[PDB]
Structures are given as C-alpha cells and as structure tokens.
Amino acid sequence: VDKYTRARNAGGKRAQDCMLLAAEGDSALSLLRTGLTLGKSNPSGPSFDFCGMISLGGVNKVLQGIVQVLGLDFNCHYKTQEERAKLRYGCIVACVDQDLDGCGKILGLLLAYFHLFWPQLIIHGFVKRLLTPLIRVYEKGKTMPVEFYYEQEFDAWAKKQTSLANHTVKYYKGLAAHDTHEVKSMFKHFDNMVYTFTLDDSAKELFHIYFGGESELRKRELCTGVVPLTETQTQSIHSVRRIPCSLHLQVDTKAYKLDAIERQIPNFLDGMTRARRKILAGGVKCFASNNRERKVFQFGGYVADHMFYHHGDMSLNTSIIKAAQYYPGSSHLYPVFIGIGSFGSRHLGGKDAGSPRYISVQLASEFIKTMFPAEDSWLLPYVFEDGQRAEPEYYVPVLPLAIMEYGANPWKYTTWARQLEDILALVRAYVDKDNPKHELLHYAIKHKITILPLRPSNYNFKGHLKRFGQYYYSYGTYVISEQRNIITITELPLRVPTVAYIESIKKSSNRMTFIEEIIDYSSSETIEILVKLKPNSLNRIVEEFKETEEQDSIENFLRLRNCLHSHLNFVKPKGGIIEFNTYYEILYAWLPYRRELYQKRLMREHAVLKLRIIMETAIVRYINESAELNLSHYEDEKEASRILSEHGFPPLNHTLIISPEFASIEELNQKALQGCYTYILSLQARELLIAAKTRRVEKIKKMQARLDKVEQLLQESPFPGASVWLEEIDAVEKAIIKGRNTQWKFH
Amino acid sequence: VDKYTRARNAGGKRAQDCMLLAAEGDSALSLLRTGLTLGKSNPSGPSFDFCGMISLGGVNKVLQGIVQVLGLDFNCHYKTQEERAKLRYGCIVACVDQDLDGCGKILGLLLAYFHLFWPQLIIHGFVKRLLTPLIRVYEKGKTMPVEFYYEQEFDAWAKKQTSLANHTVKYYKGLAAHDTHEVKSMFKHFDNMVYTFTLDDSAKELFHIYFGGESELRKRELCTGVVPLTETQTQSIHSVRRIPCSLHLQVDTKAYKLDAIERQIPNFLDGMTRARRKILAGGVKCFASNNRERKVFQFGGYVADHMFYHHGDMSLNTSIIKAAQYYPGSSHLYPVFIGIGSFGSRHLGGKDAGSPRYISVQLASEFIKTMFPAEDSWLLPYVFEDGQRAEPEYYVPVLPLAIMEYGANPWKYTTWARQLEDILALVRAYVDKDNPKHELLHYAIKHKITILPLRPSNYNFKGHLKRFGQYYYSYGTYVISEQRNIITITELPLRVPTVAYIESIKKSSNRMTFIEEIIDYSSSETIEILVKLKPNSLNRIVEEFKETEEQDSIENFLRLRNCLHSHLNFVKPKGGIIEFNTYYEILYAWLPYRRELYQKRLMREHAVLKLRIIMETAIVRYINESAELNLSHYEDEKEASRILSEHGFPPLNHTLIISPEFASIEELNQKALQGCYTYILSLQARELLIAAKTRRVEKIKKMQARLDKVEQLLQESPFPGASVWLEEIDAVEKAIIKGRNTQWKFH
C-alpha cells in the first residue's frame, strides 16, 4: 500500500489497542513521524507500538488502501462486538488541517464514506479525529501560552481584558504551522486531542444533502450563511470529547461550500468577487503617493503581499490583466486600471494579452476617486486574514456597479450591462427633492414599481438591439455586392469574438458547402470579414435558410444574432446567495446601503473636526507665547511637560487627531483627550515663522466654517447627506465622460 | 495553415512586391494587425495589399507552414534570379521581441534554418528583420521623444548632458510594451526599420558552433563573456541598414546562451546564483526595521516586487523554502532564513515541505550581519534592470561561501562542503602578522605550494569519511543481531534520502531475493530501518557480495557507500565560465576581492565622517545662539536663509550627509558642500533642550576619536584593514557557533 507504515502490534492479540492515523498529505506524515518517535521523552505517549500512519492524498485508490489495511468487509454490517473485533486496527484517527480544505472537504468525505457503507461504525466509535489548537497567545516572561480550540473562545477571552499590548497572537490554520517545541508539547497530551464522532439523529439527511448532488434542498440550504457554534455547544464538546456529525457538517463543510461560491459569484453591492476586491484595494494603496507605472508582475507581487492573496500568481496576473482591458465588448466597461501596453483585442476574446513582464499598469485616479471615495473606506467592515486587515467585506460605490458592467461565469451568472443615462435618471429621481418625479420614493421603494425605464447598454456597438416580447436580441450588420457576389461582415453581435466566430462557420459542414474561402482583414477595433462564396449560391442560401420575422435569411446563414438572457445570482453581504429576478431590485437593494454610509461619514468627520480645531488653537497659542516661554532653558523632556502643564496647555495624542484611521466615534471621544505634549514638543522650527502662522490661522477659520456647514448638513431633508450625494453623481458622471472621450487613457 | 493571413497580391504578377511578417507569438500578431490596417492615416504605409502575417509559436510544424506559404523547394538552390523569382513572397521579415528570448533564440534558429538548407537566400537578401526602438527619452513640454536603437547609444547620449531631472526614460524590451500612439508613429516610418541580414564571411563556423551541439569550440567560446558593439559597428549598421550574421550571433545569441548558465551555475565569490541573490537582497530589505515573521507567499510577493523577479512564483517559493531548510544533509549548511514551521525532513530529500500559505520565515540577523556586512553593500557593482536598481553583481562575504556549503545541479556542478575549522586557519594565516605560518602569503598563493589541510565537512554525519588515493568515500553504519537475524541500518551516507534508498533496494530484484520485508521507524533526524530477511540468508549474502578492501560484504549488499567527486564549474564576475580544479584556488581567487573592499570602505567612511563632524559642529553652534538670534521674528523662509547666511553658517545638503547611499567619494566631495539651510531650519524643538545638547556634544567627540582611528587604520601592514577583518572573522565564528548550538533557531 502506498505510504503506509504499520504498527508493531496490528493484527495480533492486542489489535484493538492499535489506531490508524490518516494524514491529509505529506508534511503531516513528517509531523506524525516527528511525534511518534519521541521515545525517551515520552514514557507514556504514542509510538509505533500501537499507532500506524497512512496517507489520504488523491481524493478510488487510497480508500481501497484503507479497506485493505483495516480489513473492512463491504458485505458485513458490524452491529455486534465480535464482527468488529476482528478488524486490524481499533479506530481510525484523521490528522487533518484545521482549515476549509482540511476540515470541510477531506474529513467530510471520510465521514460520508463511512456513513454510506458502514453507518454502524460511526455509532460505536470507530471514526475519530484529533483536534489541534487553532489560536495561541504568548505573553512576555511566561513560557506557557493560552491555547484556544475555536475562534469564538478567543473572541470571548479578548473582551474581558484591557491591555493587549504585551500579547502576541499566533494563528495555526494548517498542520504545518506548528513549530518544534509546539509539536513536542502537543504530543505529550495526545489523548486530550482525540475526539470521537457520534452519528447524530439529524445527520442522515444532512449527509444526503451535502454529499449527494445539486438539488433543491441544497440550493435552499446554502442561502443563509454560516452560523458559528455558541458557548454551550463548545463547552459540551470539550467536556465529553464527542463531536456530533451535524455540527461538523453544519459549520465546516458549509463554510467550504460557501467558500467556493464567493470565488465565482459577485457581491451585489459593488459587483466584485473576493479576488477582484483584493486587487482593487491593493491598487488604491500602491498608487496613492505617486501614480507611476508598475509592471503587471510587480503589482501582482504587491497585491499578494499586502492584501493576503494566496491562490498563486497566474489567477492574479490574469485578473489584473482583465481589470485593465478596454476593447469593445469586454468585461469591464469602466476599468479601474489604465493599460500602458498591449492588453488584448476583441478578435480572440481578450486572451491575446502580452506577457506580464512587458506591460505596465496604473490607476484611473479620476474615475476611482469619484466612485469609491476615500472618506468612506474607513467606515466599511473589513475581513481579517489571521488577525490582519485585508480588504472590506464589500465596497459601497456611488452608482450601482453590479448592473453597469458586463460579466459572466463559465453556478449560473450572466449580467448584461445597463444604460448609463437612465440609471442616473432614477438615482437622481430618488435623491433630488425638486425633481418632478420624486414619487419614485414610495411607489417604487416600498413595493417594486416602474416609473423610469432601464434598457440595455448600446455602447461600442453598431448593431441593433431589438425586443421581442420578453427578451432582447443583438443583431449584426453586413453588406453585399452582387457584382462579384461577396458578403462582407461589418459588425458581429455583442460579446462574440472573431476567431471563434470564423471557426464556428468552419466547423459547420452544412453551410461550408455554400462558401469557398473566408478571410478577415479586420483591425483592432472594427470588423471586416470577406466571405468568398461559390457561384450560383446567392439564390439558394435564401431558399434554404428561411426568412423568419426575427432572423432573416442571410442572418441565420451567417449566424448574426445573439440572445440576451441573464442569470442574476449574487452574494449577500453577511453570507449566502440571493436569486434576484429583475435589474430594478438590485439597485433597490443597493439604495438603503448608501445613505446610511453618508450619515455615518458626516458624523465621524464632525467629531474629528472638533478636536482638530482644539489642537490647532493650542499650537497657535504656543507659537505666539514661545518667544517668552523659552523652553530651551529647561533641562529635559518631562520638565518641559510639567512647565507646559503649568501654563494651561491641554495634553493630547497627536497621532490620533491628525489621522483617525479606523477608530470609531466612541474611541475618538474616550481616549483622544488624554495624552502628552508632543504636538507642541515635536515642532519643526519652520512653523514658528510668520507666514506659517498666517496659513494656520486661516486653516482654523476654514475648519470653523466647515463645522458650521456639517452641522447644517446633518438636518437636511430627505435624509442627511442629500446635498453631498448629488455632487458626487456629477463628479462621477464628469469622470466617465472624460474617460469615454480619451479611449480610457485620461490625457 | 495555422495563423496565416495572406496578402491580396501574393502569388500573382507583383508577387515580388509582397513580404511575409513572421511574428513570434500572438500579441505580436495583434500589433501587426493594428499597424497594417491604418488605412486613411497611412496613404503610403504597409497594408494587407502587400504584407501577410504568420506565426512562429511552437519552436517541425510551423517551419513546414513557412515552406508551404512561401513555396520553397528543398531540392533547389536559388542561385539564379529566375529560380527565386517564382517564390510567392519577396522576402521574410521577423517581427520579434528585442530581448534574450526573442533576438537570441527565435531569430537565431530562423537564421540557422535558412542557413543550413538555403545558404544563398541569406546572401541575396531574402531573410530580414525589423528593428524597433529599445529606449526612449521624454522631456516635458515636447511631444517628440529621443529614440535609441541600442543601449550604448543611450549611454553615449547620457554622458554629454548635465540635468537629467526633467527626463523620463522608458525601456521597451518586448514588442507588447509599445503604446497605441507609439505604434502609430512607428508604422509611419516602416521602411526605416527593416534591416537585411548579410551572410558574413565568418558566419559559417559560428552557426556551426552555436546551433550544432555541445563541443569543445563552444565550451571554449562561452568562457569569456559578451562584448558589446562599439560606435563604428553601430554607425555602419544604421548607415547601410544591413546586419552581418556574425554580429547578431556574437551579441544576441551569446547573451542568451550565457543567460541560461547564469541561472544554473553560481558565482564563485558568494556561491549563489542570480535568483538566490535576488532572494537574499530582498530578505535583507524586508526584515530590516522589524524582524517579525512573515509567510512564504508574502515574502515571495515582496521579492517579486522590489528585486525584479519575473520567473513566476513556484521557482521563487521553492527557492525561499530551500533557503530555510536545516535538516542533516541539506543544501545550505548555513541558512540565511529561520524556518518557523515545518520545512522538510531528510527522508524524502526536503521535498515534503508544507504549503507556503502556512509557513513563516524570518532572517538570521546575527549570522547575516557578520557575514554580509551592511557597510560593504553600498560599494558593490549592482545590476540595473530597465533602469531600476535591482541587486548586486556579486556579494563579497567574510568567508569563502562557495566552498562552505553543499550544492549540486541535476552543466556539471557538484560541490561538497569543506570543514570550517581549517578554512578559518588559513584565512587567519593569511591575515595575522604574528601568526607563525604567515609564509602562506607568498609560498602558497604566488608559488602554489600547499601548507594547510582542507578536508571535507564531517558534520551532522555519523558515518566514516575515508580517503583512497585521490577520492573520498562516505560510509554508513549498521548493527546485526544474529539471534533473530535482522539487520538494522542506523546511518545512511551523505546526502542520500531515505525513501529513495528504500525504493533502491525494492527495485533491485537480485537482492530482494534475500530479504522478506523492509520497514523504517526512523525519527525526523536519525535513521532506524529494519530489514526483515529470510532464514538461511546470513551466510550466503557474505559469499555472493564479495569482501572488497573498500566496500565490505554487508555494505555492498545494502548499498552503504557513496562517492565524493566534484565538478567545480563557476561563473566569472564579469561574465563567462571558470573550470577550477582544486578547492584551494577558489579561495585564492577570492582573497584579492576582499581586501580591496576593506580599503574602499575605510576611505569612503573617512570622507563621510569628515562632513558629519562639520554639520554637527554647525548645528550645535546654532542651538546655543538660537535664544538670541530669535528667528521667529522673521517673516519667511528665504529671509531666514539670508539672515543665517549673514551670521556665518555654512549651507549644506542634509539628505546627503546623513545618508550617503550610493554616491562615490568624488560625488561626496563635489556637490555635498553647496546647498541650503535645512539642517538648522527643520529642527525638532526637542533638540534645543540641554540633555539633547549633551548627547550631541559627546557624539561629536566620538566621531573625532573615530576619525583618528580611521586615519590610523589606513596605514597598517600587511594592508589597510587587517585589524578590522580579523574581528569580523571572530564575529562570524561566534554567530556560527551560536547557531549550531540552537539547531539554527537563535534563541
């Protein structure tokens, strides 16, 4: 058997004292080999006397290897204690990574295989696992950490305490992350990790739902998001050391099944998947100081460093390249990057881009500053990859970016982008009070109605968009010259590449018999295809390919018609799948998420502007009285702190007033008023001059008038921020128009 | 034919006006399609009337496609102007990347294919290329750039000028790097790019040497490094628009052949290849401020960003993991990283390391600061990749790191690491004057007579190292217990993994007939293999496998002997291959490269320490007279500059005195004394206090005594810096010993 070490007492008289360790891969086998052979260090721990390893890598074949090394019978049932007394090992233990691929997939399939064939051995305690510490906390001076076996235990432990400055918190998501002394202290308490799976009462139908195919019970289970284990379930598990099958299938395997969907289907607020959101949030960061051109592989190295992107580089590089492409009929109609180089053309679907070693990239920086404003990205909920900030759960943009640009998936997801000039009409009919169709506020928001039209894109397209009852179709154009009988194709329909279209005519033997040769002299943007066809063919291709009222006789000869049908499946902001059915209700489910963020922005910058005015009044008082205070006389730093305390200057923290990054308004009012004297002490000996003082005095006057306007804005009808969300509609409209007149180069 | 567009007049009456554009790949075909179809913009340029494209991707098959689309005859010779008048295109043009893969390999094989079969068509001008601008220079205000077709032309143009601050310099190494307006201005001057290959008189034997196999003429051509084209050759080429075959084969193809060997063979100064040197120079940079752990994919993203690493990530990630492995018998005996995680064991060759998503890494920082000191890395020759500063040409370490750690290559290169305690003896016999064997200074280097042993490693090894005449062999150990007749293998010989050794015994059918079962219970470090063998076998395996004086009867039964033979092929610092033949002459070729860097370090920091003392005397005079000068009275910044000029303060540049990064000593003395007043002006209002003044006054006293010692050091026998190179030997010895007592964790 491949990768199987047997115990020295398997099969014999104590062949019910021997257990089988089923590792996931090949590093885990070296961890188990490290731990079984301690010898002199563990007089009581496990060894190769009663434990034998095996692999599971490749899921069959290794399952037949498990059947061969245990002695399992496919025809028995193992109900009595003498049928299962002649197995070769006592139990099976799974030494699997505690991540989504480990606990969600390998252990789930191992449980489903032991459930479909021998559902008595789960009951009598034959299938086990060993559970490893997920999170540890080290404090200085002490050697012993504080080991947590779930994330909610650490979350409960962290709220009780105050100072978390001298603690370092390590996460261990996979079994290769455990260092040498950590493994040597794990396998001295080996029996306190092995937990036993009990076949729960409701586990039967859950095994059938998950590991049984795509059906309606599964498709209505996955529409609600993962619910974590509570405190009582956790305490019961750690008391009796028994795990129900239902709790494992309801936490780990469901998180794995929703892990995949979140990679293929976009969130409906911004219209982006998880990888594209890492790419956008990294591209705002690296092109913030200087908007120079980085190569695609250098920007890929940045995004895989700072945004925690771990799926290799080829998916990353092709997503960066797909973020920059601006040919007619491409995915992004409003790209977030500018393509300095050659990124691909419409003729073979955008897959003829250059090597990423040769092509540069840089931000839009005029579109992207008016669509995703930087004074809202401090207020969005973030994801935390091993206790580090990575990216938002979702961006909230100024216009609904999920119905505005094309997108498809080879879960069914297909979006056909909607016209700009009539989503702007209904957003500005929602907001503007004096707009004479503000009765979209109630008729169309309480229940779903229709007041303003919303039709497909029709941009970079010279065909025709025609509606037949309930569908739209996209047509092409052609021109015929009967003097030499050649058909020239001038426009393909939407999203159809040209090399695939030519080979689509090549592989049709039924209509290759009417043409002689076909060649394309098209250029990078337009279409010019010459169809050299045989003589006496113009009159018979009209009398075989029938004139339908939809598709006329030359169109169905040349395949010049496409169907616009759309699958509107998205992802909830909390988790789970929405099956929308109209393009209206996506934006009606987007509008309540925007105005709340306007109100929260206005209140937070109201508070920060208060204490900015305070600290700069204090520093302009210092730079007037500094000629007579003469702090160079004094001996040290705390003496100058005392003397500045005697003259009535407030102590303040200078790092938190100038840059409140992610602190909430309660944190801004609790611990931002006590501090020290460094806003005065670390001056520049250039702010003491008279022109600097003049600049700072007019700056304090600007902030006071701004405070007056913010307090005016927070009591505006219809809601706080209506007169700051129309001007951002105008700014993003002006940047879109300035980008459509430059071929998205922004000169 | 796959990917072939034909011209509208090929084959016909003007079938000698038509040319064939042979692109390298698939982005180049879209560039050529962009440029041929300008139409109304080029009334005179090329189009699809007299030009037709084809691909070359896959080098056969595409060469047969070229033969099919041109009409070439394998049996003709094309000597007369009527044999070659019935070809279907007039000439062939190659639209190839101007990089090492493009010009060095694709165009070289195209020339060799047209030379081996039709060596008359190169003469009569059938094989061409089109040459693109490599480097452009844009200056603000002007639209027209200054296009250069070689790197030496830009190097000549850059020396004439003074201000290169308002110029931006773009490099175009591959044909996908050309923006849309740049392509539209390239193909308005299309005829001024097409150059013609002339079959040179000496090109015959050079084609045979390069594209003819591995022989002695090639192996003695590649030992000298690439010589660039001069000014006269360049001017002749750009005058007559004709390229000899010999100049292309001597620049481009030789640079390609030496580019692949620099990826596999190490430089002999540091013992590192090009990719490992990018990894070391990136690892010194990211763990400089805070040496906290950072995962292997995040550090890979850093190294692919800042050190210009473009070979994908899988080679990068496996080189980072190979840089951190510290099992017995591994490649690096002195690793530059610390492996926080599970990085592999000796049993399957170090290829069982965990996923890079789960494992952390961090520097040595105590070994690496005493081996590659940071006050020498400003002085080394660096490589420049697209004008950016990437990594040095070679590090120069404190001990010869090429003969100190193991290394091999599947060019023949195999190094067996040498004993530490007797390379330290001969380095300290070279340096120390009072060492009673300082007669190694002339009698062993200049006269080549050995006086100091230097034997193999013998560390992490419990076998025996025995010498038989001219080779060393490495043996293993075993123990036999004849009561049950089981052989226990306790130590394999050097560098032999255990899974491969077990399968080596498994696949030998001639000696599997003496054993019954074989299984291993080894620990991650030690070896414990049980050989269950058949009865009546102990007396016949000694009478078939003969007792040789080298390999005894059980050793050649169990394959417990290895051969230590070494191929000492390296790379010159300037370019080319050295074939060394002894381990002595590598370090004797290393010692003249170290003491020159000591002398250069002492002189540069002598100069910088001079002007540091000057600027801090000036700033301590200011912070005494600042209570009475009272510059807060003054109105602006240039007024304070004038008033500080009136009181006799020197103007200085503060960014270049505190951090002379890569400036030479001549640049330190030319433009580091004129400047402005910002070293006074941007003070802190914390340096004015009395304790800060005390710190700065004793700092100036320390720098004055240091200047006295540097002027003492520069006139020391045997050479400048002998009393600063013995203490660094002691520091690196102490760090190596502190790392061998911690299993390279540095607690």
| Domains observed in chain B | 19-132+172-261 (3.40.50.670), 274-403 (3.90.199.10), 465-564 (3.30.1360.40), 595-713 (1.10.268.10)
The enclosing H or E element of A22 equals: strand A19-23
Burial A572-609 (b: 16+ CB within 10 A, else e): bbebbbbebeebbebbbbbeeebbebbebbbebbbbbe
Let me know: does B20 contact B130? Beta carbons within 8 Å.
no
Rounded Cα distance between A573 and A589, Å, is 11
Q: Which of B500, B498, B505 is nearest to B524 (CA)?
A: B498
Binary contact (A636, B689; C-beta < 8 A): yes
In a 3-state reduction of DSSP, which class is residue A439?
Answer: helix
Experimentally determined by: cryo-EM
Contact criterion met (CB below 8 Å) for A725 and A398? yes
> What is the number of CB-based contacts under 8 A between chain A and chain B?
228
Strands (E), B310-397: 337-338, 360-363, 382-385, 388-392
Tell me the residue length of chain A: 747
DSSP state of B21: E
Run of H or E residues at A415: strand A414-415
Residues contacting residue A136 through CB under 8 Å, at least 6 positions apart: A145, A146, A147, A148, A169, A170, A172
Contact at CB, B358 and A303, closer than 8 angstroms: no
Which residues of chain B have a CB within 8 Å of the CB of A34? Answer: 345, 523-524
Do residue A689 and residue B637 have CB atoms under 8 angstroms apart?
yes
Breaks (C-N over 2.5 A) in chain A follow: 59, 410
Contact A112, A176 (CB under 8 A): no
Cβ-in-10-Å burial (0-12, 13-18, 19+) of B124 comes to middle
- Separation of alpha carbons B270 and B247, rounded Å: 33
Say how far apart CA A418 and CA A455 lie, in whole Å.
6
Cβ pair B634:A690 closer than 8 A: yes
CA distance B514 to B408: 34
What's the count of helices (H) and strands (E) in chain B, helices before strands? 26, 24
Residues of each annotated binding site of A: 24, 97, 99
CA–CA–CA angle B88, B93, B99 (5° rounding): 155
Whole-angstrom Cα distance, residue A313 to residue A319?
Answer: 10
In angstroms, the Cα distances linking A130 to A32, A98, A103, A191 are: 12, 10, 11, 9
A459 is catalytic: no
Q: Choosing among B298, B326, B484, which should be mutated to test the A contact, i.e. which has the most A CBs within 10 A?
A: B298
Beta-sheet strand order (sheet of B91-95): B51-55, B19-23, B91-95
Q: Identity (one letter) of the amino acid at A746?
A: F
Chain A residues lying within 8 Å of B630, measured CB to CB: 627
Q: Does A680 sit within 8 Å of B519, measured CB to CB?
A: no
Beta carbons within 8 Å of A579's beta carbon, 6+ residues apart: A223, A568, A569
CB contact at 8 A, B562 and B496:
yes
* A285 φ, ψ (degrees, to nearest 5): -80, -45
Inter-chain touch A623–B632, beta carbons under 8 Å? yes
Query: Residues with Cβ < 8 Å from A120, sequence gap 6 or more?
Result: A77, A78, A79
Least Cα separation, residue A316 to chain B (angstroms): 11
- B122 to chain A, minimum CA–CA distance in Å? 31
Provide the 10 A C-beta neighbour count for residue A223: 14
Contact residues for B80 (Cβ-Cβ < 8 A; gap 6+): none
The β-bridge relationship of strands B407-408 and B388-392 is unpaired
Residues B251, B228 contacting (CB under 8 angstroms): yes
Mutate to test the interface with B, among A4, A40, A290, A297 (most CBs of B within 10 A): A297
How many whole angstroms separate alpha carbon A117 and alpha carbon B721? 78
Residue A317 φ/ψ region, left for φ over 0, alpha for ψ in the -120 to 50 degree band, beta for the rest: alpha
The answer to whether the Cβ–Cβ distance between A681 and B685 falls below 8 Å is yes
Chain B, nearest residue to A388 by Cα: B294
Of A33, A178, A637, which is closest to B524 when you measure between CB atoms? A33
Strand partners, A359: none
Min Cα distance B744 → chain A (Å) is 12
CA distance B353 to B319: 12
HEC secondary structure over A647-685 = CCCCCECHHHHCCCCCCCHHHHHHCCCCCECCCCCCCCC
Closest partner CB to A355 (pick from B31, B176, B691): B176
To the nearest whole Å, the CA of A47 is away from the closest chain B CA by 10
Cα separation, A508 vs A519, in Å, equals 16
**In the structure encoding, which two tokens stand for residue B469, read together?**
């005449």
